[PDB]
Each structure stands twice: as C-alpha cells, then as structure tokens.
Amino acid sequence: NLCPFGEVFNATRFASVYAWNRKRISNCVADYSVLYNSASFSTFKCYGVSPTKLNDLCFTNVYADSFVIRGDEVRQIAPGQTGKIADYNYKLPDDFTGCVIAWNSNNLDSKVGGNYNYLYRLFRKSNLKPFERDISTEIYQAGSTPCNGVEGFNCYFPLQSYGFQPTNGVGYQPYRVVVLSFELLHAPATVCGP
C-alpha cells in the first residue's frame, strides 16, 4: 500500500481557503523524502517533527489539507500566526506536528480577466479554533441591528474573491498549499514510513 499523495498534490483543482479540503491517509507506506526532494516547492517547512526522520517515525493517522492563497499569506500558515487567514480561514494549533508545503501556481489558477473562483472569508464573528472549518455565507452584522440575510450599510457579504491574474505581483499570485498533519493516538499505527 502506497499512500495516495499523487492526487492530493497533483489535483486538477484545489479548494478555496475558507472551504478547504481535507483527506485522511491510512494503511499505506509513504516516502516523505521523495516529496522533500521534489524541489519544485517554494516552501517546505516542517514543525514539531524533523524531516529525514519521517521515514523513522510511525503514526496512527495523517491528514492532507489543500487550499490556494496569495503568496504573501503563506507566512500565516504556521503555528502562532495572526492575520485574516490564521483567524478566519485556516488556523493551525500551537502544538503542530506536520509540514506545510507551498508552491506557485500562476499557470493553473489565474486568468486574464481574473479568476473569481477562489474566495476567502473577510469578516467573522470570532477567531477559528485549531483546524475548524466555516463555510457559512450568512450576512455579517457589523452593528447593532440584525441583518436578516439582506445587504446594506452595516451588513456585509463576508466572503470575497482573490481575483488572480497572470501579471499580479509575486505576493498577490496564487500559491497552492498542502498541510500534512500527523497524529499519535492510542491505536495501532497504519501509515508508516519505508
């Protein structure tokens, strides 16, 4: 059994950062050094565990989260960050044990007039909790009077698009991000290195 990283990394379309995908990966043998030596990634940062050791460690379950952001926000995908991604879209815990991979995708996820398929939650009542997900589009109430699903002053549609374009800056260009998480639970280990 070989862990199915091939359709997680090389998926034809990634999600948005508010409605991010997850995938459970169990009962398989994964070689992490073959990923680390792809060298086609802008960012490969492992927290809580050192690479070159992932083949010598064995975990109950691992999870692969996939989402697209802009280049300047990959700094926010990390333990202890703060922003409009670490608070409202994707939050990583202080006890993270995994690896954040990220790579430029201006070829696939950008269009001449703009690509409005990729969204992010701009306003939210409170900060996300570690690994929580929020896909509601309820009108955000910014004042004292309720917003019964109708827009106006004081009431905002919370999501908003990135509007990727082929010639945006390098910090405003699409970046595909895959967060691998490893869990050590009191149970037989199923996903394990070679």
């Epitope: 059994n1 359709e7 998926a11 034809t12 999600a15 995908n21 997850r22 995938k23 459970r24 169990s26 009962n27 109950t60 379950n61 999870y63 815990p93 909790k129 570690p130 690994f131 929580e132 997900r133 896909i135 869990e183 639970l185 009191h186 149970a187």
Partner: antibody, heavy 128, light 110 residues
Framework: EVQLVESGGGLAKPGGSLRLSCAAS????????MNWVRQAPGKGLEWVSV????????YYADSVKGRFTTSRDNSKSTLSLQMNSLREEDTAVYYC?????????????????????WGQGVLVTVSS | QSVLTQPPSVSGDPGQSVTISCTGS????????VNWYQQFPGTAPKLLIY???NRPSGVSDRFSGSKSGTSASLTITGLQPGDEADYHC???????????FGRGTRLTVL
C-alpha cells in the same frame, strides 16, 4: 463485543415529533464520533447526521437540516435523535452507526467516516 | 457529480467470481476513500471493506475491494449460496461534505 441498541420508533402523523435513543456499550462511548444513518423501504441507504466526541458540533444532511437534532450524553453513554416536523418520505429504518477511526482534535473538520458497528434499526413510519 | 452508480443486481454461478462496480466522480471516489457494506435482508449492514482495499478482522478473504481512478469494484471469489445480500458502496463527497451511499446491489447466485 460492541452493542448498539435503538429505541423510540412508532407512528406519527405528518408534523409529529419523535425521539430515538441509541444505547451503546462495549467501547468507550465518549471517544468516538457517532452517526445516524437511515434506509427507506427497499430504496438504498442514506446518511442523516453526525455528532462529535463531546457533542458540541453536529452536522446534518440537507434533506433533514433544520428539523432533526442529534445529541449525546456521555454520562449515561447514550445517543439521541429528535425528529420534528416529520414528512412521509421520512418513513425509514434508522441505524445508529459508529465511527471506525479515532480523532484527536474533537473540533476540526474530519472528512471520511467508516462505520464498523451499526445497530438493529428502529422503524419510523410517518402517516395516519 | 454527487451520485454513485451501482448496478441494481449482479448474478454468478456458485464457486465462480463476481464483480460489482461503483462509478463515482472526482469529488467522490475519484479523490476520496470508498467503503463497501454488506446487509442481509432483515438485518443491519456490517462493514465489509473499508478504505477501498482493506478488510476488517471477521471478514473472510473471499471479498476483495479495489478502486482505480473514478470507479471502485468489489470482487467475490467463491460463491457460497449463503452470502446473498445487499452491497452498499459508500464514497465521500467534498462538494456536499457528507457521506454518500449507493443504491445497493442484490447479489443473487444461480
């Protein structure tokens, strides 16, 4: 072994309310996310809802969203489903599945459920 | 596509092999795990194959599960007249973010 015993089915006129209770023993109940699945008479299977290890965040199918409500009491080690505003297309058998896997964060978004231990199935007919 | 399509019924002579097919989509099986359940008429379903390849402890090695791209399959080698049941293919859909199921297939032996 692992025992799932359902109770609380019967007759209800369209618009009535019922409360199914699933007594679960043989495993640490608090630790596993618990499901509710349902089967129409002779027509496939269909998933209904899921509840966490602590009962804080429940998720429902869209066909039953806003009407049914899943709950669980880890003190008495029981599961419960409160059905309100019933329709006659809710004539089914309701199984109390269990999540095969073990999750760490109890609040994150986990994305594949395999059910290893089901229940006998209470028959809920909604008619007059 | 949010729909998993099994045949309504498959048939095979005893002792031979039988293949059941479940063709989903990309957000379905194509990108996520599959589970096959078995249900004898009048009783609950039990986990037959999980994660599209494995078997739990109590399940015998006559049932094999596979999944390759869009479609998954179940193979039964050796057809005892006593394993007649309903076989439920259970993908997961990222679009709906909920567990999918199939119409179930009535395995009949000749």
């Amino acid at each position: 072994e692992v025992q799932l015993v359902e109770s609380g089915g019967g007759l209800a006129k369209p618009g009535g309310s019922l409360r199914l209770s699933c007594a679960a023993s043989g495993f640490t109940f608090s630790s596993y996310w618990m499901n509710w699945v349902r089967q129409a008479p002779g027509k496939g299977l269909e998933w209904v809802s899921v509840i966490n290890s602590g009962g804080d965040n429940a998720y429902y199918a869209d066909s039953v969203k806003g009407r049914f409500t899943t709950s669980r009491d880890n003190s008495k080690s029981t599961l419960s489903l409160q059905m309100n505003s019933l329709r006659e297309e809710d004539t089914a058998v309701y199984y109390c599945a269990k999540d095969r896997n073990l999750y760490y964060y109890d609040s994150g978004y986990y994305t594949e459920f395999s059910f290893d231990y089901w229940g006998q199935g209470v028959l809920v007919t909604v008619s007059s | 596509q949010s729909v998993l399509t099994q045949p309504p019924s498959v048939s095979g002579d005893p002792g031979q092999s039988v293949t059941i097919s479940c063709t989903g989509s990309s957000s379905n099986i194509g990108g996520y795990y599959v589970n096959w359940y078995q249900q004898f008429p009048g009783t609950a379903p039990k986990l037959l194959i999980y994660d599209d390849n494995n078997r739990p402890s109590g399940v015998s090695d006559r049932f094999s599960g596979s999944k390759s791209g869009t479609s998954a399959s179940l193979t039964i080698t050796g057809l005892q007249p006593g394993d007649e049941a309903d076989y439920h293919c259970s993908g997961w859909d990222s679009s709906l973010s909920a567990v999918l199921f199939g119409r179930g297939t009535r395995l009949t032996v000749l």
